[PDB]
Amino acid sequence: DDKTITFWHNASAGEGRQYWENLAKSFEEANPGTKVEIQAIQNEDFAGKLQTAMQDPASGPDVFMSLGGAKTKEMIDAGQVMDLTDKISDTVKTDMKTTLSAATFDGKVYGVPVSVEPGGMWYSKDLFKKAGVSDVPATYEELLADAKKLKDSGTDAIALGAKDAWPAAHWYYWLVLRECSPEVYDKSVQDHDFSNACWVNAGKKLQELKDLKVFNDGFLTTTAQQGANSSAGLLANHKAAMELMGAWEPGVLKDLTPDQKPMADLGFFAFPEVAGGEGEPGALMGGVTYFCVNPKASQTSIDFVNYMGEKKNQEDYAKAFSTIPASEPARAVVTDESLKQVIEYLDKAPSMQLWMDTALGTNIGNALNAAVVNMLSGQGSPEDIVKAMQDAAQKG
Numbered sequence: 001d002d003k004t005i006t007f008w009h010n011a012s013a014g015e016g017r018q019y020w021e022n023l024a025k026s027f028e029e030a031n032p033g034t035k036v037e038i039q040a041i042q043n044e045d046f047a048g049k050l051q052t053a054m055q056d057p058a059s060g061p062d063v064f065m066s067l068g069g070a071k072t073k074e075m076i077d078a079g080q081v082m083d084l085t086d087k088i089s090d091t092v093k094t095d096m097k098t099t100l101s102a103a104t105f106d107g108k109v110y111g112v113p114v115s116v117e118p119g120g121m122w123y124s125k126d127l128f129k130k131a132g133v134s135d136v137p138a139t140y141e142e143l144l145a146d147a148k149k150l151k152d153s154g155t156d157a158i159a160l161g162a163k164d165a166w167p168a169a170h171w172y173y174w175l176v177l178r179e180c181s182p183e184v185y186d187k188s189v190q191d192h193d194f195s196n197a198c199w200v201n202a203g204k205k206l207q208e209l210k211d212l213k214v215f216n217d218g219f220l221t222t223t224a225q226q227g228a229n230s231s232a233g234l235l236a237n238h239k240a241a242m243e244l245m246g247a248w249e250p251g252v253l254k255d256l257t258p259d260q261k262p263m264a265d266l267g268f269f270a271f272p273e274v275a276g277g278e279g280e281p282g283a284l285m286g287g288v289t290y291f292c293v294n295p296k297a298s299q300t301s302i303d304f305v306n307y308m309g310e311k312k313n314q315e316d317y318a319k320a321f322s323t324i325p326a327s328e329p330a331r332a333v334v335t336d337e338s339l340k341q342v343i344e345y346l347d348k349a350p351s352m353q354l355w356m357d358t359a360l361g362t363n364i365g366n367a368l369n370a371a372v373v374n375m376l377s378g379q380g381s382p383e384d385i386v387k388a389m390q391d392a393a394q395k396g
């Protein structure tokens, strides 16, 4: 049938997963004859299943979460993403003013944003007190010192989900964004040119952290979001003191604590500044989640994504996922002190870079994430990270 749409998302948390069921049901109630068939896919599996299914758009999801950045661009150029410019509602246009640019390519809108998720450090204030760290580090060297204190106090300072590749790389991305001048950064990302010494500088500053041996001991086999021993699991259960992640974090932790209630002592601080770095200071980096429509899909699919953008649905989103909703007026409903800081940092930001691997596309993103892991496991150098990106870049 044509009033029956297939919907793919990545909410693994029960609350998040529940929210979508509820939106589906209450959408069927305002849309007679229409049934939403849901697939919830674990995030680390999502790209593969999407990129396989959408080889044949006819037999693929009507509505799906976007991979973002260059990865969304790859799907557009494959004709796997419907143009929603003349199709989004006026409520979307108005309330997602800021966020919609993440979904805009060649002046065309390809999706509806549901959240904006900038990155930084999520930490156990308690484990911080127990190690003698009273203030959050404004500098990289200061941070490495706090790792020294935390290691001595007998806790793993930093949880690292290196088994998934990207969580490791996030350290590298942030170092680059603090080392590279905004112009070298922006140009490197667009031109796939990585010759500047700030790319190697960054890895060196990362090697230094590795040498301090302050990661959780199984970081190489630790996933990011799966199970109690995942890196978010370790943070949520106070087995590790901090993690570097996007603002989806509180809702993930909330799903992994012993009682599935928010983490009592969760705190946030921006990525520290780096001495001698040329990065625009306080430069934000993060993500925007949005949903795309199959080009082979019908009006019901369109009405579904517009339904996502409505303020009540977005306010619910914010509470279900413990995140910042895309819709500006829905953000009023955000009560979490950590998210409140992040919104502040967000509100006064000149810009926000998308995740680096997202910005660089599949080949380069993957090669990069993999090489950072290589050097953290002692089988690679800062130079090898650059080499890998350059090599993958030859494909386009």
Ligand SMILES: O[C@@H]1[C@@H](O)[C@H](O[C@@H]2CO[C@@H](O[C@@H]3CO[C@@H](O)[C@H](O)[C@H]3O)[C@H](O)[C@H]2O)OC[C@H]1O
Pocket: 010, 011, 012, 013, 016, 017, 043, 166, 225, 246, 248, 251, 252, 287, 289, 321, 355, 356, 357, 358
């Ligand atoms: O390539 C990297 C990405 O894959 C990464 O994806 C984000 C990671 O985690 C996701 O958080 C989910 C939020 O809601 C819960 O219900 C889920 O269970 C989590 O999986 C997130 O939505 C993705 O956008 O971001 C950064 C890249 O480096």
